[PDB]
């Protein structure tokens, strides 16, 4: 599964600065979804990849940003 990284408390996406390959997004995605996750910077937001199918990504059902 793929999707925008989301702050589980605020419902916000995670903003990044350098488009494309991005170690910030990579590490934040892994920190959230686990060591198998990938991630890169897309339109200045962190887009996570290789997520387990049940993973919760942006947007949060309950919480709007």
């Amino acid at each position, epitope marked *: 599964k793929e999707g925008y990284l989301v702050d589980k408390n605020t419902g916000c996406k995670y*903003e990044c*600065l350098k*488009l494309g390959d991005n170690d910030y997004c990579l590490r934040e995605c892994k920190q959230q979804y686990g060591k198998g996750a990938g991630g890169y910077c897309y*339109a*200045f937001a962190c887009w996570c990849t290789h997520l387990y199918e049940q993973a919760i990504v942006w947007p949060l059902p309950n919480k709007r940003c």
Partner: antibody, heavy 117, light 108 residues
């Protein structure tokens, strides 16, 4: 309400240095990417530099790379921009802005920076 | 080569109560990654829309953004006096992020 307040602007000669600071209030400062942009009076907008949450991702406009250094102090809720080797064309109002994930969703009132001999 | 945003017209002369239609054309597709700002005389920019159509908080209903790809518009359905300002578009599909040259909406 979400507010940003810039300081540290002023007049210097070419080759001089300034340190801009921005203090944020009314929001959780450490939860947002923060940016500096600038606007020559009477002219358009230009993004200058920006820094992600946790200072994990940092970038600069090509025209200021090697000369400007951005940093943040989350405890103090401050963003800083050390501007060295200032040039005439760096003259502008400098704005601090909160990142809106692509856009810039909140802007300070700006601080004037003049570089002139 | 960076994305060029062409805003037209450069100036738009209109009467209060009237409708204003501002155009932003991108040199190539920016999908929906386009923001609009208003800058009133003697003030800092103010975000109006992001993702082309998403209203920022406190922006009156009379403002709407639309479009995708290369052609975007900002529409003000019925101009209030405070609506007379400069308006900028800004893309964020690519780096460097770029702005249009602005459209001034002024009294007729």
């Amino acid at each position: 309400e979400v507010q940003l307040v810039e300081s540290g602007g002023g007049l210097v000669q070419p080759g001089g240095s300034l340190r801009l600071s921005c203090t944020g209030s009314g929001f959780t400062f450490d939860n947002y990417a923060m940016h500096w942009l600038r606007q020559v009076p009477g002219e358009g907008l230009e993004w200058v530099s920006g820094i992600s949450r946790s200072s994990g991702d940092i970038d600069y406009a090509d025209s200021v790379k090697g000369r400007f250094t951005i940093s943040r102090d989350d405890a103090k809720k401050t963003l800083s921009l050390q501007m060295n080797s200032l040039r005439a064309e760096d003259t502008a109002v400098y704005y601090c802005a909160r990142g809106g994930v692509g856009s810039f969703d909140t802007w300070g009132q700006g601080t004037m920076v003049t570089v002139s001999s | 080569s960076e994305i060029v945003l062409t805003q037209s017209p450069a100036t738009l002369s209109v009467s209060p109560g009237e409708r204003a239609t501002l155009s932003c054309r991108a040199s190539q597709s920016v999908r929906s990654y386009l923001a609009w700002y208003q800058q009133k005389p003697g003030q800092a920019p103010r975000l109006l829309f992001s993702d082309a159509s998403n209203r920022a908080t406190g922006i009156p209903a009379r403002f709407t953004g639309s479009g995708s790809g290369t052609d975007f518009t900002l529409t003000i359905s019925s101009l209030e006096p405070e609506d007379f300002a400069i308006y900028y578009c800004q893309q964020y599909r690519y780096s460097p992020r770029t702005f249009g040259q602005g459209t001034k909406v002024e009294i007729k």
